[PDB]
């Protein structure tokens, strides 16, 4: 009769670079027990700020325990290291973690993980980060590098949609047309985005990543000789030999500047496959980028 | 039929959870819930049920026994090894855990390195059946110097006249007559030297009668001079032979 | 000079006989032999422990970035083609940057050709590669070190 | 006993009739593990 979820009261929120904005001087507001968590339904310390000039006054949505558990932002619900949905990262690494959906089991599991984290060092996304050591499979290809500030854009003025926004240019909300309501990208359940179940953004990025054969190769009839284009005279056979020395023993390494192709062949099929996958539009040696294909 | 089976499983799980919540300390509800989950081929659900029951009361022998038997009845051998390691490290004085761990790692496991694991039990000074089973296990693995060290530690840890007689019989059966004579001499020098047990002297006289009848007659005369009716019977047997 | 072919190292994991690449790197082999004679690599815990890539021990600082060699302050990493960080049982120095190497020895059971050009290989593990592979298979924290500390008990630089 | 089974059969028949035509703050045991307690790991295991 004396078990309940403890209230998470802590400073220093864990946010992305994009949602934090671009100004080095940010004015910041904190409520001690302002709102509830959007997932585990516990009260938590709510942080609110304006990321920039014409932004939305973004505020934290989920509690710090859930965000430390899934290694995501407290507002964007995207991964801190890569800026991806957690469904995409779970498809990349491991999807056997899961979480309960019924509220009593969810509160019990969250209390157990909170006690485990509080008995730990304090800032560690459990052993899942231990399963996150293997990386750069395909997630680095579609990961953003620039801060996408267009998701800090303000909301659409509903009075302007009906054509009755009497504020005009004084209205801070957007006086532009919204997205298509018939589009299935516009559903976006928050619990579905947190749990990584049927998120349409994750499905669209998985379909986009599946159409980019950056690790396919294998266009030769059991021949290890593959041609990497884009090398030219800038990349010589020494860089190809240094790249193939990690795979073991190389059968042949050569570079031809007449066709600007590096011919790489290995005595092992697995080493030649790894050398073709590493050089398929992802290898840069001596200032020259190589794309692997049949030769 | 799938929806009816799901409703039946939901009703059975609701009644099992209500029986758990009504009386938490009654472990038979936990055992029945875990066996019903194992009968529906849900290994991880029954493992979670058993882990919850061990969190409720870890001192029960039957919870560990049933959860290790459920791990061993399936193909989860390493899970059963982890379960037995936890059961040994929490409850070392329960010999049934040791016996079933050694039968699991000896018959099904067939690993000789489990004998090194068995040496962990030899840190705990168990009852004499553990020493006898380890003697017979080292004989089944065809080791006699190791079994000599085992029986020497058995004599040092649990000294008894029957233990010294078993050491003499094991040294005689392993074709080490000089070691058997030295063990009989050490047993005469230490075990009942002033207590006058008059039973290790009879075994030494029997070993000498197997070896040389003059030393057997001398041992029978020394036993008759040191002393019962059995010593007089042994002296009459030595005089008749 | 000091050009030992193979040395021995006894630790908590076991005893390993490691060959020294004195043919291609005689100065680094002499510095490693002098550090083994002075006990610089003996008794120091494993500062760097990668996830089954390279396990480095013998660093006196313990953070993986410090340490002192027998040549004085820091040792320049002169890599050679005869001693390269490749294959299984490659012995090298875990250098964080170029031209800065201590007396620490790192055993690698996996391919490390990317870090082979920035570090000088002390030799190869002729024996005890399985003990180094079992030591490197243990999980570590974010500081490339676990909670338990493993060091080197004795070192014999024979030769 | 039998009356409760007949009531459950009638409720299942009414549910199938309504499907052919909240959760009351409960815990659904058929959807996931109710209180998931993972087994302790040590010295072994390669999963399945």
């Amino acid at each position: 009769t004396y078990n309940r979820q403890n209230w998470e009261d802590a400073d220093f929120p864990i946010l992305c670079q994009t949602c934090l904005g671009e100004n080095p001087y940010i004015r910041m507001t904190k409520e001690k027990y302002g709102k509830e968590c959007k997932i585990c339904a516990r009260p938590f310390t709510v942080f609110r700020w304006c990321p920039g000039v014409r932004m939305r006054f973004k505020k934290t949505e989920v509690c710090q325990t859930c965000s430390k558990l899934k290694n995501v932002c407290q507002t964007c619900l995207l991964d801190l290291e890569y800026g991806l949905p957690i469904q995409v990262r779970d498809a990349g690494l491991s999807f056997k973690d899961d979480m309960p959906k019924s509220d009593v089991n969810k509160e019990y599991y969250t209390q157990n993980m909170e006690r485990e984290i509080s008995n730990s060092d304090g800032t560690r996304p459990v052993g899942m980060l231990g399963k996150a050591t293997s990386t750069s499979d395909m997630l680095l290809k579609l990961a953003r590098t620039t801060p996408y500030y267009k998701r800090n854009r303000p909301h659409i003025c509903s009075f302007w949609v009906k054509g009755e926004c009497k504020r005009g240019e004084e209205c801070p909300y957007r006086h532009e047309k919204p997205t298509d309501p018939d589009d299935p990208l516009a559903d976006q359940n928050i619990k579905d985005r947190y749990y990584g179940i049927n998120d349409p953004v994750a499905d669209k990025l998985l379909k986009r990543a599946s159409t980019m054969p950056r690790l396919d190769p294998p266009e030769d009839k059991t021949i290890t000789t593959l041609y990497v284009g884009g090398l030219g005279d800038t990349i010589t056979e020494t860089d190809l030999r240094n790249h193939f020395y990690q795979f073991g023993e190389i059968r042949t390494i050569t570079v031809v500047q007449r066709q600007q192709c590096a011919f790489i062949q290995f005595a092992t099929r697995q080493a030649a496959e790894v050398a073709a996958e590493k050089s398929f539009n992802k290898l840069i040696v001596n200032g020259r980028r190589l794309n692997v294909k049949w030769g | 039929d799938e929806e009816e089976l799901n409703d039946y499983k939901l009703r059975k799980r609701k009644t099992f959870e209500d029986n758990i919540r009504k009386n938490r300390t009654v472990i038979s509800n936990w055992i029945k819930y875990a066996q019903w989950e194992e009968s529906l081929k849900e290994i991880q659900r029954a493992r979670s049920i058993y882990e919850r029951a061990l969190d409720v009361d870890y001192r029960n022998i039957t919870l560990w026994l049933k959860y290790a038997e459920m791990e061993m009845k399936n193909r989860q051998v390493n899970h059963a090894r982890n379960i037995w390691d936890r059961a040994i490290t929490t409850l070392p004085r329960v010999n049934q855990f040791w016996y079933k761990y050694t039968y699991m790692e000896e018959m099904l496991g067939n690993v000789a390195g489990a004998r090194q694991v068995f040496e962990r039990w030899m840190e705990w000074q168990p009852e004499e059946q553990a020493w006898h089973s380890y003697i017979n296990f080292e004989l089944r693995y065809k080791e006699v110097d190791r079994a000599r060290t085992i029986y020497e530690r058995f004599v040092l840890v649990h000294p008894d006249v029957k233990n010294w007689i078993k050491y003499a019989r094991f040294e005689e059966k392993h074709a080490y007559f000089a070691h058997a004579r030295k063990v009989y001499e050490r047993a005469v020098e230490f075990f009942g030297d002033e207590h006058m047990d008059e039973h290790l002297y009879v075994a030494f006289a029997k070993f000498e009668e197997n070896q040389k009848e003059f030393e057997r007659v001398r041992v029978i005369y020394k036993y008759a001079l040191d002393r019962a009716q059995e010593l007089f019977k042994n002296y009459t047997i030595f005089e008749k032979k | 000079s000091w050009q030992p072919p193979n040395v021995y190292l006894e630790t908590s994991m076991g005893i390993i006989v490691l060959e020294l690449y004195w043919k291609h790197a005689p100065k680094t082999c002499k510095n490693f032999a002098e550090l083994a004679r002075r006990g610089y690599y003996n008794g120091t815990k494993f500062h760097r422990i990668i996830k089954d890539f390279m396990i480095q021990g013998g660093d006196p600082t313990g953070t993986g970035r410090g340490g002192a060699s027998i040549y004085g302050k820091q040792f320049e990493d002169e890599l050679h083609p005869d001693l390269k960080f490749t294959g299984a049982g490659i012995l090298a120095m875990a250098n964080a940057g170029p031209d800065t190497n201590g007396s620490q020895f790192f055993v690698t059971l996996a391919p490390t050709q990317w870090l082979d050009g920035k570090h000088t290989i002390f030799g190869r593990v002729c024996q005890g590669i399985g003990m180094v592979n079992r030591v490197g298979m243990v999980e570590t924290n974010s500081q490339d070190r676990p909670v338990d500390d493993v060091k080197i008990i004795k070192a014999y630089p024979s030769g | 006993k039998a009356r409760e089974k007949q009531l459950e059969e009638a409720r299942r028949l009414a549910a199938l009739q309504k499907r052919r035509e909240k959760r009351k703050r409960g815990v659904d045991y058929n959807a996931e593990i109710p209180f998931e307690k993972k087994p302790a790991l040590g010295f072994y295991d390669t999963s399945e």
Binding site: - | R120 | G87, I121 | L41, F43, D45, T46, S47
Partner: peptide, 19 residues
């Protein structure tokens, strides 16, 4: 050079595996 889930086993001195 010329070649081209479990837990951590802890052993102290002659003590075979710290349990």
């Amino acid at each position: 050079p010329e070649i081209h889930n479990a837990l951590a086993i802890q052993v102290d001195s002659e003590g075979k595996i710290k349990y």
